Every structure is written in C-alpha cells, then in structure tokens.
Amino acid sequence: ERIVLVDNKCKCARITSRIIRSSEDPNEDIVERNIRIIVPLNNRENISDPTSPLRTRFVYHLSDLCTCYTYDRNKCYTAVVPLVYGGETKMVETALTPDACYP
Amino acid sequence: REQLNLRESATITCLVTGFSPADVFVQWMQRGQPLSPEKYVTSAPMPEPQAPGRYFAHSILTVSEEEWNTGETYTCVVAHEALPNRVTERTVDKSTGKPTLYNVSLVMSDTAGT
Amino acid sequence: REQLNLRESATITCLVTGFSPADVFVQWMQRGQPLSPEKYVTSAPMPEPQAPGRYFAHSILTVSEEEWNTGETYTCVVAHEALPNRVTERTVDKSTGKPTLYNVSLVMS
Amino acid sequence: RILPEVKVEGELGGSVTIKCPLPEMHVRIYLCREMAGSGTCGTVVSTTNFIKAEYKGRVTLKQYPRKNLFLVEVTQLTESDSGVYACGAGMNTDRGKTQKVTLNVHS
C-alpha cells in the first residue's frame, strides 16, 4: 500500500509515503513520511579502509538521498594488504566484506 | 578490561577457527605496516572439540598500554588456502573493541524536501 | 517546494475564479501598505472552460526567496462589484498549512 | 521476502523437509528457528557442521545446484517442532533471512 519513494542503500535511508484512508468524512486526509535511517555505529570514515577514526557524524540530507556509512550487500569492497613472509612483499588484494563477492 | 588497569601491557588475540587443514599463515600490521615476529606469538593448530577435523589457532600480540589507548589501530591478516581470496583480515582499535562510549552526533536536515 | 530549493525567488499566485461579469481588480498588500505595480502582474479575464458565463484571472507576485522565509504575509486583495462589501482579501504565511506533527521513534536497542 | 507458510504434517516416524532458495555462491546458507520469547533467531542448521543441541543427529541438509531449491529434512518429529523456520544467507542469522515458514505437527 506504500509507494517506495526512496530505497537508498548506501546511506540506508528508506523514505516512503502513503495516504491514510480515514473515515468517509471531508478530505482531511494524512500523508505519511516513514523515513527510516539505520545507524551503523561501528563503521569507518572511508567505508573501504579500516585505518581511520570510527564515526561521529551522521548527516542525512533527504534531497541528496534519492562518502557512505554502510556496505552494499551486493557490492564488493576490497583492499591491498601488505603481507611479506620474509623478504619479498606480495601486496595482495584482501576482502573487507567476505561473502558479498567472491573471486 | 582488568588488563588495561595495571598500565603495563595489552594483549590482542587473533583467533582463527574452523580452518582445515593446518599450517595457516598469520601476521599483524600496525597502521598499515607489518611488524617483526619479535612482538607477536602464534600457536600451533590444535583440534576443535565439536568438530570432526576442523582446527583452531591463536596469535597473541603484546603492546605497551599507552600505545593502545591513543588509537594506533591494529590489524590481524591471515592467509589460509580455503579463503576465496586466500587472504583476509580483521581490525581493532581503542574505539571499537568493547567500547564504553557511543559518542553519536547524528544530524538530519531537510526533512520535507522535494 | 521545488521552486524554493533553487534559492532565487518565491512566486505567490492569487487565483480569482468564478466571478461575473468581467473587470475585476487585484492589489497586493503587505502590512497595510500596497506593493508597487512592478512587483506583481495581473492577467486579463478569460472564460471558464465548463461554466458558460463566468471568468477567471490570476495575479502573480514574485519576491526574493529569502524574504518568504521569515513570516511575511503578502495578502492579496480583490475588488469586484459582486462581493458583499466590494472588497475581499486572502493571506498566506510560511506557516500557513497545517500542524505537521512529527512522530519521532528514536531507537537505541 | 517470501512467506510460503505450508502445513506439512509431522510425527515421530514422520519426516518433513523444508525448501529454500540458494544464491549458489557458496556463502553461509542456514535454516533458523525464531524464538518468540527471545525475540531473536537461533540457527538450527548451518553451512558448517553445527547442529542444534535438541536436533543432534536427526536433521539432514540436502543441496541441489541443479534445480535451485535448498532443502533440509527432519527425520523424527517430537511434535514440539512448531515455529518460524526461516532460511537465508550471509554470515548474519537474524537479519539475513530470505524466506520464512512455519511447519506443523499431526497434519
């Protein structure tokens, strides 16, 4: 019954709307605004590099809502990890999101 | 918590479970650069109680107490065969491991908008 | 709402429909004193598409976008020879709609 | 978000197998019995060798990449197996469920 007005998946806002069918009275209807932001509370500054301070601000302008906080479940985020095993250093691509993407 | 009270040293433990077979490679990085094996000690792969053939291993890293309170994010990177990318990692800092402060400053603007 | 996000101007329209005969007059008052004729524009009466012998008009007042932002009434006054006192007026504010009750549901669990 | 609640009957001797969708990318696919009192979800069957303590040895996992149905089977029914069994994926269990369905005892 609710039209999916916004289904943002990178800041996770899920704004929507509907018209509430009131009684058979004059049209003093109500329009709904079910905004539903979910706070990660444990992610980093860049979403793709776990070395920055964690997260203080959470800015949500709903006009730029149609850098991110959360991780897209169908997207893959990776990085270069500098391992060595002795003298050589094979900088190899790691996975910051094991299971959203496979090699 | 009680280890960060004597103000002498802090131990971060990287525990790898379920991997089979043995002989997994583990190391630590401090602010994106690796450390010598003179500061972290790994354990031999031991069997698992409820698992038929899966194993587990521990790698402890000991650092100065004041080296962990100011930040200085540590990462544990491991590389076992079975990994789809053959290499994975995890990370902890003072603001992430069992925190005592959820310092939140979320702001929401332009509620009506277009 | 779409026009106010351009942050340039605000456009208030005084819609005068359902009068008869023609020759309706429109002015734009603000806190008692009228506005200059160069601030608003009035169109000529045109017949109603369904109603046989009636008409309509319009009166566009364009102001700076910031000026709408602080209260400020802009009441439109209409004079036609069929009104009970020959003068009527309407007004809007930034605050002229409804209650718009917020219903916040902050969750920490 | 599929909700195909079916009325498959069960008994001690009786065996009921649930059907679930698979992404087939070798992620963590699990069946989980939601607890009404707890308000969370407790994994009864997982990709790994974990099995619930109550369901030890009486459950079987059956995966067909060919037909795109992920199905799990229960050997014996004690008649207490009435709850929201939801399937799913990802490491997470609660917030990752794909489809849910409640099985039933007797009929």
Ligand SMILES: *[C@@H]1O[C@H](CO)[C@@H](O)[C@H](O)[C@H]1NC(C)=O
């Ligand atoms: C940290 O954020 C920057 C800014 O976009 C970006 O390059 C990346 O996500 C992080 N930096 C590195 C070197 O990974």
Ligand SMILES: *[C@@H]1O[C@H](CO)[C@@H](O)[C@H](O)[C@H]1NC(C)=O
């Ligand atoms: C909590 O967040 C505010 C907002 O930026 C910041 O000014 C303050 O320093 C933070 N507190 C601590 C202990 O970091």
Ligand SMILES: *[C@@H]1O[C@H](CO)[C@@H](O)[C@H](O)[C@H]1NC(C)=O
């Ligand atoms: C919003 O208001 C409706 C009725 O006015 C109420 O049923 C609902 O619980 C409210 N939403 C909250 C409290 O999050």
